Amino acid sequence: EFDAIKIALASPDMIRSWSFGEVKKPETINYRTFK
Amino acid sequence: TPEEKLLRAIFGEKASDVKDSSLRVPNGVSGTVIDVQVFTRDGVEKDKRA
Amino acid sequence: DLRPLVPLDGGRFATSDLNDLYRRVINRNNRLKRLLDLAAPDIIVRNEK
Amino acid sequence: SQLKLLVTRGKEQGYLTYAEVNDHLPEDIVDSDQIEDIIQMINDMGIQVMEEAPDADDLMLAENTADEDAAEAAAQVLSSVESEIGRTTDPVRMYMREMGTVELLTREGEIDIAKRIEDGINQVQCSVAEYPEAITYLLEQYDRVEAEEARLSDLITGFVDIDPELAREKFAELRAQYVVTRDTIKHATAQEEILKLSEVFKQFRLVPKQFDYLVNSMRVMMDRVRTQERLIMKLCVEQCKMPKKNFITLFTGNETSDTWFNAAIAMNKPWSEKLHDVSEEVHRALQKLQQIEEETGLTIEQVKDINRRMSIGEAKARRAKKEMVEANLRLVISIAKKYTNRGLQFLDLIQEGNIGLMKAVDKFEYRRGYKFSTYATWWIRQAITRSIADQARTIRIPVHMIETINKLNRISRQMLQEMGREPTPEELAERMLMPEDKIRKVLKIAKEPISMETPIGDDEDSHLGDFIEDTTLELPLDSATTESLRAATHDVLAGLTAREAKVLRMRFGIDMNTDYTLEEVGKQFDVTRERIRQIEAKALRKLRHPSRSEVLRSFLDD
C-alpha cells in the first residue's frame, strides 16, 4: 500500500500543512463542563 | 442509528435513558453473600437497606 | 488522543506529561509574544527567548 | 591535559568511577551542574560512568557503541572546554549573572530618571501638540461625545485642573482658540497662533488610548512619507545612478513642488534621460506628498522635524523607563522566591513580574514622592499571583475560584486545630457563609491531577496509561449486532412493496443520510403528509405480527 517509508526534515510550510489550526491558549478543558 | 429508529418504532418501547452500570459477580466465582455494608454520604439521606 | 485527559473515578483525572510540556511552550510563546509587542528592554526578552 | 587522560583511562579500562572523574576534573570549576554535564559528555560515549568498582561480567556484557565518530566530536568538545570557566546553559544562573551587571538606584537617581521619563513624554507631547489635525480630531471627538456616544470623562481624564461643566469650560476654550488661529491663517502670526493653539492643549488631560489613537494615525502618515523618501531614493540613486548631490541639493531642502524632479529630465546626463523611467512613478508621489501638505497646514520638511522630535523623545524616555526597569530587577527576584513552589517554574514567576514591573513604571507618579519599591510591590503581588492563578494548573481555574480554595485552604487549616480532629464538610457551611454546595464543589476540584507515566508498579514496569480503558470505542459484539441488524432489516423490508418500504427507508435514515419529515416524504409523492403518516403506520402495523417479526423481536434486548 505504501511500499517504502521516507524520512526527511519537516518544512515549516509542511508543519503548517499538517496542522488543522493553531494552539494559542494553554487551557486544556473547561474545568466545569470538562469540555 | 437507522435500523433502530425502525425497530424502536415497531415495538414502541422507548430508549431507557438511564444506563445499567451495576455491580455483578465476576465470571466463574460462585459464592455465598455473607455481608453487605452500605456507607452513605451525610447529604444523601439513606435507602431502606441502609 | 495521543496525550489524553481521561476522566477517572470520583472527579479525578489523569493526563500525560506532554500536556505539561506543551503548556510550558504555549505559556512562554504567549509571554514572548507580549514581550515583543511591548518593546521591552532587551535583557528580559533575551531571557524569555 | 587531564580530562583527555580521563577519556584515555576510561577507554583503556572500560569503565569510570566517580573518584576517577573527580580526580580528573580541573581546578577552576566548582558547582555540580557543569561537572555532571561533563559526566553526560563522557557518558554518551558510553564508558559507563557509575558509582563503584564495577563487576566482572558487565564489561563484556555492556557494549561500546558507536565507535568512534561520536567520540571524535566529544573529543573535540572535551579538549576545548579545558580553557574557559564561565560556561553554563541554565537561564536561571545566566539570568543571575546578567542581572548582577545592572546596579541599583538611589532615591535621588530614581526620581531624576523618573523626571527624565517625564520630560521625555513631555517632548513626545510637545511633538504631538505641535500638530493641528490631532486637535481637529479632538474637536470632532468632543462633538461626537456631545451626543454622549462615549463617556467623555472616561474618554479623557477630565482635564488636569471631576465635573463635566469644567470639561465643558475647557472645550469651549478650544473652539474659540481654534477659530482665532485657523480662520486667520491669511502667515505672519498664524504659526504664532498655532503656537498659542498648541499651548492650550498641553494642559488637557486625556486617556492614553485616546492619546495613542492620534499618535499611530500620524505614524502611518509618517512612514508613508518615509515610504515617499524611500520612493524617491530607491528610484533615483540606484535605478538611474542620479548622483546624491542632486538629491542633497535639489530635493533635500525644497521637497515641495514639482521642480526638484521633473526639471532634472534635461541635465543632459544618462540619469537625466533615465528619469523617464521614474517620471510617472514619482508624479504619484508628487501629488500624494502635497496631499499630506493638504493634511497638516505645514510643509513636508516641517513634518520631518515633527516626528524626529517624536521619535527621539520616545527613544529617550522608553530607554529611560527601561533604565528604571533594569535597575529594579533585583527587587523582582526577591519577590518571586516567596511564590515559587506553587506550581509554576521559577523563570516564569520572574518574567511575569517584569511584565508588571514595566506596567508599574508607566503608572508610577513620583510627584506623590513615595518610594518606588512600595508601588511596584503591589503589581508584582498581582501579576505573579495572577499568572499563578491563570497559568499554573493543567485545568485552568478562574482567578476568583482559586481564591475560593485559597480561602478554604486558609480556613480549614485553621479549623483543623480550632475544632478538634478534622473539619467536616458540613461544618464549613457554618464558618464560611457558602451554603454547603458552593463549598462542596470547591473540594470536588482536582489538583494537576495524575501523570500517565505513573508507576503502578513492579508488574511489568506498567504505567497508569496501561490500565485506562476506552469506553467510547465499539465492542465487536455490538457492532456485528448492528451489522446483522442492518441485514435483518433488509430482509424484513424485502417483505414490503415499492412504496411502503421506501417511505420507511426515508422516514428514518436507512441507506440515505436523512430522516426526511412527514411532509418531505409527502413532498416526493405530492401527498399532504396524512396518507404518508398512515402508510407508515400501516407498514409499521404490518411489521407487528408474529412470523413477520420473528427475527427482529429477537434482535431487541429482552
Side-chain angles (χ1 to χ4, degrees), chain A, chain B, chain C, chain D residues 1-318 320-446 449-558:
Chain A
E1 189 245 313
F2 43 88
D3 217 338
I5 290 162
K6 151 128 174 44
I7 188 183
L9 271 62
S11 147
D13 327 329
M14 202 158 190
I15 291 175
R16 299 192 211 118
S17 144
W18 297 329
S19 169
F20 289 81
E22 181 162 15
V23 197
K24 307 214 179 65
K25 291 164 270 294
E27 57 198 21
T28 51
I29 51 181
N30 204 81
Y31 117 98
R32 171 184 227 89
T33 33
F34 313 131
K35 275 198 176 38
Chain B
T1 92
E3 299 97 31
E4 191 79 32
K5 275 187 259 278
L6 176 50
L7 195 82
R8 285 213 165 279
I10 285 172
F11 305 101
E13 164 191 356
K14 277 80 46 187
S16 278
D17 112 271
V18 90
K19 70 155 52 87
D20 210 315
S21 145
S22 84
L23 166 70
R24 48 199 67 254
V25 196
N27 243 11
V29 39
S30 300
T32 322
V33 166
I34 72 170
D35 230 6
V36 171
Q37 347 184 51
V38 180
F39 299 102
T40 333
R41 208 167 47 89
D42 44 57
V44 179
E45 281 168 54
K46 256 123 179 184
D47 216 292
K48 283 153 299 204
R49 186 59 127 87
Chain C
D1 199 28
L2 318 193
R3 30 166 180 97
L5 219 170
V6 287
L8 283 202
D9 69 284
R12 215 48 205 271
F13 287 81
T15 72
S16 313
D17 312 17
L18 294 170
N19 265 330
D20 294 319
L21 304 165
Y22 275 115
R23 241 181 61 237
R24 182 138 26 254
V25 173
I26 289 154
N27 284 302
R28 294 183 180 189
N29 195 61
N30 284 348
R31 194 189 316 157
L32 202 250
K33 230 182 185 184
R34 306 195 288 154
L35 278 154
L36 70 90
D37 280 323
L38 231 59
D42 191 56
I43 310 173
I44 62 166
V45 192
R46 275 168 203 192
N47 166 244
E48 191 49 68
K49 271 183 195 174
Chain D
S1 100
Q2 271 328 289
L3 281 160
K4 185 43 79 200
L5 250 62
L6 182 74
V7 176
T8 320
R9 216 149 68 127
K11 296 171 174 174
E12 105 182 349
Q13 253 174 337
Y15 65 100
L16 288 171
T17 95
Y18 293 160
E20 319 287 357
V21 46
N22 257 40
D23 297 323
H24 290 4
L25 303 163
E27 330 293 330
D28 258 10
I29 325 289
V30 190
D31 200 286
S32 186
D33 212 318
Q34 291 89 313
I35 80 164
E36 253 165 39
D37 279 292
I38 293 163
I39 284 303
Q40 284 270 8
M41 289 317 291
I42 196 85
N43 209 349
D44 67 330
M45 311 320 197
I47 335 173
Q48 197 198 10
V49 179
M50 319 187 103
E51 175 94 54
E52 49 152 9
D55 294 323
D57 186 25
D58 273 320
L59 296 96
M60 316 151 60
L61 253 53
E63 309 121 333
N64 227 21
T65 63
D67 282 272
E68 304 171 329
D69 171 57
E72 290 260 282
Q76 174 143 7
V77 167
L78 267 166
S79 314
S80 276
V81 214
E82 290 271 45
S83 314
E84 235 290 327
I85 85 157
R87 288 308 320 279
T88 167
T89 41
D90 319 352
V92 39
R93 299 193 158 185
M94 295 205 284
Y95 187 50
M96 296 305 137
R97 206 169 51 183
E98 305 186 8
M99 190 264 322
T101 194
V102 183
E103 278 287 323
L104 269 185
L105 275 195
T106 52
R107 181 76 136 276
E108 312 310 282
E110 258 173 331
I111 52 183
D112 61 50
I113 296 185
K115 75 175 75 85
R116 199 161 106 189
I117 293 157
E118 184 132 343
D119 213 343
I121 62 99
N122 259 346
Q123 181 187 350
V124 168
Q125 286 193 357
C126 162
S127 328
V128 159
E130 256 277 324
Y131 195 78
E133 300 241 3
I135 220 157
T136 74
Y137 212 118
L138 184 58
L139 255 61
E140 277 97 66
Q141 265 287 338
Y142 152 68
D143 290 345
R144 81 206 33 177
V145 199
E146 257 316 295
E148 299 306 319
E149 286 162 18
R151 198 147 280 282
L152 209 41
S153 195
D154 248 341
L155 193 125
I156 59 193
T157 333
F159 295 110
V160 43
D161 288 345
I162 181 152
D163 313 307
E165 309 314 296
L166 175 70
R168 291 299 59 61
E169 202 271 347
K170 303 214 98 146
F171 262 128
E173 164 208 338
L174 211 193
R175 303 229 184 218
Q177 183 59 60
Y178 190 67
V179 298
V180 300
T181 289
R182 171 218 57 198
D183 299 339
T184 62
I185 280 304
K186 332 105 194 165
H187 207 201
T189 192
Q191 275 143 306
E192 279 69 27
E193 267 156 356
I194 299 162
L195 178 152
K196 296 173 286 100
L197 189 137
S198 272
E199 280 280 340
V200 302
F201 173 65
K202 306 216 216 162
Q203 217 173 323
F204 289 166
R205 186 177 57 188
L206 306 94
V207 143
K209 319 188 304 171
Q210 299 287 317
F211 191 64
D212 287 12
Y213 288 157
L214 315 181
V215 171
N216 294 290
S217 162
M218 305 156 42
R219 275 192 232 234
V220 313
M221 211 41 69
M222 187 49 223
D223 79 316
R224 172 181 160 193
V225 192
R226 291 288 138 106
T227 325
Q228 292 340 286
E229 284 168 66
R230 276 191 283 101
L231 212 69
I232 303 150
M233 210 230 97
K234 286 159 166 22
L235 313 178
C236 276
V237 203
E238 56 144 22
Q239 211 52 61
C240 308
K241 208 59 232 83
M242 154 183 170
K244 215 174 201 162
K245 209 59 63 195
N246 301 92
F247 185 80
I248 274 297
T249 319
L250 302 186
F251 177 66
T252 322
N254 177 36
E255 286 157 68
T256 310
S257 171
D258 305 9
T259 330
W260 59 270
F261 192 67
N262 330 92
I265 331 185
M267 309 317 210
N268 322 94
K269 294 299 185 289
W271 64 267
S272 93
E273 308 309 287
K274 271 244 171 285
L275 279 195
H276 290 292
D277 203 303
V278 220
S279 45
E280 67 92 8
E281 169 106 359
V282 204
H283 205 253
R284 298 210 54 100
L286 268 178
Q287 304 325 105
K288 288 307 153 273
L289 164 150
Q290 284 202 33
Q291 154 134 328
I292 289 145
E293 300 170 8
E294 255 269 1
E295 290 150 6
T296 170
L298 287 194
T299 315
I300 296 302
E301 185 46 55
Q302 282 142 355
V303 170
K304 272 201 53 169
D305 316 327
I306 272 170
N307 75 106
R308 199 202 152 264
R309 263 134 43 194
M310 204 195 74
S311 307
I312 299 309
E314 211 159 309
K316 159 197 157 198
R318 185 177 35 84
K321 81 142 47 163
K322 88 175 155 49
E323 273 174 35
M324 196 163 296
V325 157
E326 279 140 351
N328 305 134
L329 294 187
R330 324 183 171 275
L331 166 79
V332 184
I333 302 195
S334 41
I335 305 185
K337 282 166 163 45
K338 320 143 61 206
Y339 282 81
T340 331
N341 267 318
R342 301 176 258 222
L344 214 40
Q345 276 194 352
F346 185 39
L347 276 312
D348 294 351
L349 308 138
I350 291 162
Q351 279 289 328
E352 295 284 326
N354 312 6
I355 279 185
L357 171 77
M358 270 177 316
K359 276 133 197 199
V361 164
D362 193 277
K363 224 175 98 128
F364 169 62
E365 320 142 9
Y366 80 116
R367 300 286 215 160
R368 261 181 178 270
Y370 312 146
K371 212 172 179 302
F372 181 73
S373 152
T374 62
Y375 198 36
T377 320
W378 284 117
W379 297 81
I380 301 171
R381 267 184 208 106
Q382 170 150 305
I384 284 194
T385 320
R386 279 289 212 274
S387 313
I388 281 298
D390 215 359
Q391 289 133 29
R393 292 159 133 272
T394 113
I395 328 160
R396 194 183 62 86
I397 298 197
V399 41
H400 54 273
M401 183 44 78
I402 284 128
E403 301 160 343
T404 308
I405 323 173
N406 270 335
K407 185 164 275 189
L408 188 43
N409 282 25
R410 197 184 43 82
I411 276 306
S412 170
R413 164 210 281 107
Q414 191 193 2
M415 264 179 161
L416 188 61
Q417 315 158 209
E418 262 209 26
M419 187 198 187
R421 341 109 266 109
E422 306 170 11
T424 93
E426 291 207 318
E427 165 71 27
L428 301 184
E430 183 262 359
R431 169 73 156 240
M432 320 156 74
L433 327 163
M434 321 332 137
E436 205 256 321
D437 309 312
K438 216 194 73 40
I439 210 77
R440 198 155 302 255
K441 69 213 210 191
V442 192
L443 300 168
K444 204 141 305 194
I445 301 170
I450 312 269
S451 185
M452 271 187 310
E453 197 24 272
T454 292
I456 301 310
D458 307 1
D459 324 274
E460 41 166 358
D461 218 76
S462 205
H463 50 290
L464 200 51
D466 209 352
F467 305 117
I468 167 68
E469 51 255 21
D470 42 357
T471 166
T472 57
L473 217 63
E474 224 64 86
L475 299 176
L477 189 46
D478 311 335
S479 162
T481 312
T482 298
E483 195 235 42
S484 214
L485 192 49
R486 223 163 156 258
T489 277
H490 192 49
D491 281 37
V492 150
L493 292 185
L496 282 200
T497 90
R499 270 154 72 135
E500 46 251 49
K502 216 186 158 191
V503 46
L504 253 67
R505 277 155 186 251
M506 73 167 44
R507 274 288 288 135
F508 331 110
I510 306 178
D511 54 285
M512 44 200 85
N513 68 327
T514 211
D515 200 320
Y516 300 96
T517 190
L518 226 39
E519 202 78 273
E520 268 149 12
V521 188
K523 263 157 60 185
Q524 297 199 345
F525 307 137
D526 191 56
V527 185
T528 67
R529 93 199 208 190
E530 200 35 70
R531 177 56 186 177
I532 296 303
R533 191 207 52 119
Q534 284 135 31
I535 207 165
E536 182 217 18
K538 147 150 270 181
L540 188 83
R541 192 195 100 265
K542 194 165 294 187
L543 305 184
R544 225 75 78 110
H545 312 134
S547 314
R548 191 54 83 93
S549 283
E550 71 273 29
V551 50
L552 290 174
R553 176 56 177 141
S554 169
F555 245 115
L556 246 189
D557 32 24
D558 311 313

